[PDB]
């Protein structure tokens, strides 16, 4: 519900003097947003759900190639009409056989032949569509207020601390104004619009593994099929029958079912979890505008922490050009601001490392409290420092 630790994270500084920012959220991704003199926050899309799909086509892999028929016609006696031609009970196809006396016929030459095999379906590689009112989005907003390695990921704690929230967005009401206590509030206006990927892609269903395929690769494929009826067309895939037989029996070999034809075109189409009636979009995106002129700092009237500060371990690399670390405050005094900055060289006057966790501060007055901090240090070597003078501690770091 917050960004820290995720690999799909993006940091943003809306604009210059901007109280709002335009953004893009997607499936498993998160976004951290910074704004002068205001708390940092993380907008993140949690879930995509349909809280009403419809089938479109249905290619089969098949069985019933059991019953046979061979309406025979002697030479010059014309064509052969198999009674199994009145109902789709079977699939018929004509041919001719060299014959004559040898096999009961009076003259010698080509005789008509019209055999038939039966057709019903087994494993239907079903597929459906995704109309662009049942689409609801679930966006979670976090606030980079005081935290600890511990509480940073606990949704509960955070909600309790009024430093988090999880609301939904719908085409009905595409916006929301999430209130965060003394931090004011953030109001998103996400626009359900998405491509994201356009509905243009079909909904491929294969046994258990659902996938998202291109309208055409799908529609324009070679396999028996049926729309919404028990009636099947193009069952011609009941092939490899024409051993070009005798009037007695035309081998109707069931065409070998090779799931390779499908599987092979796996990677192309994106995979997606699908329950009987639902398709969780990950495929999908959402353009939002994080208006936040109502987002406000807190604990700004407090004094600076003036007591020792100890590191609780080597800072860690987030893999995003920022590092994380947790402090401990020897301080007995209450909620005070944490004097931490990033200095290019010991005892420099001006900072150089911007803090993600802006305006940090010991939440409680209960001495030895922990403080989590994420900050982006400058490239190359630098120093993280907390406190000043002879209280001040430090730890070096080198970005690349």
């Amino acid at each position, epitope marked *: 519900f917050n960004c820290l630790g995720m690999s799909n994270r993006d940091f943003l500084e809306g604009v210059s003097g901007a109280t709002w920012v335009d953004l893009v959220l997607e499936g498993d991704s998160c976004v951290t947003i910074m704004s002068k003199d205001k708390p940092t926050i993380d907008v993140k899309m949690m879930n995509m759900e349909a*809280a009403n799909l419809a089938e479109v086509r249905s290619y089969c892999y098949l069985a019933t190639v059991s019953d046979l028929s061979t309406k025979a016609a002697c030479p010059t006696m014309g064509e052969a009409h198999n009674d199994k031609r009145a109902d789709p009970a079977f699939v018929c196809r004509q041919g001719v056989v060299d014959r004559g006396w040898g096999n009961g016929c009076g003259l010698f030459g080509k005789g008509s032949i019209d055999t038939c095999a039966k057709f019903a379906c087994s494993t239907k590689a079903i597929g459906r569509t995704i109309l662009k009112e049942n689409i609801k989005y679930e966006v979670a907003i976090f606030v980079h207020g005081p935290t600890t390695v511990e509480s940073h990921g606990n949704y509960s704690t955070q909600v309790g601390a009024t430093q988090a929230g*999880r609301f939904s967005i719908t085409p009905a009401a595409p916006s929301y104004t999430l209130k965060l206590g003394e931090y004011g509030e953030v109001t998103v206006d996400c626009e359900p619009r998405s491509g994201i990927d356009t509905n243009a892609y079909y909904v491929m269903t294969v046994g258990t593994k659902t996938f998202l395929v291109h309208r055409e690769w799908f529609m324009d494929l070679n396999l028996p099929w049926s729309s919404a009826g028990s009636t099947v067309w193009r069952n011609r895939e009941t092939l490899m029958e024409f051993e070009e037989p005798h009037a007695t029996k035309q081998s109707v070999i069931a065409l070998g079912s090779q799931e390779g034809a499908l599987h092979q075109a796996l990677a192309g189409a994106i995979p997606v979890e699908f329950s009987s009636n639902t398709v969780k979009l990950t495929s999908g995106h959402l353009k939002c505008r994080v208006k936040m002129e109502k987002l406000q700092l807190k604990g700004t009237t407090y004094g600076v922490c003036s007591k020792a500060f100890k590191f609780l371990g080597t800072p860690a690399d987030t893999g995003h050009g920022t590092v994380v670390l947790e402090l401990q405050y020897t301080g007995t005094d209450g909620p005070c601001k944490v004097p931490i900055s990033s200095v290019a060289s010991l005892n420099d006057l001006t900072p150089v490392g911007r803090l993600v966790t802006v305006n940090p501060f010991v939440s409680v007055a209960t001495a030895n409290a922990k403080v989590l901090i994420e900050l982006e240090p400058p490239f190359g070597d630098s120093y993280i420092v907390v406190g000043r003078g002879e209280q001040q501690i430090n730890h070096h770091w080198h970005k690349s």
Partner: antibody
Amino acid sequence: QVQLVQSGAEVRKPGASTKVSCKASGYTFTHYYMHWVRQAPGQGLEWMGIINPSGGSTTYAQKLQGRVTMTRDTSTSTVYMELSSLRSEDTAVYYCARDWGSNYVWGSYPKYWGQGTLVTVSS
Amino acid sequence: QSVLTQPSSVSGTPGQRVTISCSGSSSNIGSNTVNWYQQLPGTAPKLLIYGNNQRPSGVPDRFSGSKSGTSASLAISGLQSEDEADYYCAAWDDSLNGPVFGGGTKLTVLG
């Protein structure tokens, strides 16, 4: 799978109020409306209202307007129904039911039903 | 008093077809699609039919719904003992601006 677990059976005197809970799981809580429907013993179903867990907006049955209140807690995925000024005629099994998935109040209908909570109003 | 009108009781023998009517008005069934719920004894209702004639997964084809003007109907073929239950029709009502129900039909399966 969608699961809705309601609070236990209750008894109340006429004039009192009752607050029934419905704990949801197995789906994204704030993406689906929640309906309440009640059924007096041996009688038919009566829709009571609907709440949007996103934002908390409600629409109530006209006949209950003024003494029913629906609320939700999004952190605990729980919806509540409170009915006040109870009378004997409010004796019923009270069901919460997740909506099918409408993105609008219009055309919503209950699809996944909780187990029900029997509330008896008696002197 | 319910907004949609159903027979209080329908009965049939195992294997037969039975139907359950549901009569409404232009403001509900006439304009909007009908849903049906099945409520087995001692249990919560479950959705049986939606959108006049659509079945949720798991509901067998011998349950079928239809709508004609301001009335709707549920047909149950191949009646089974386990079908004994209360059945409710439902629809959105434009005039009341909310979902309405029929009074319910108790389906009994005879010997």
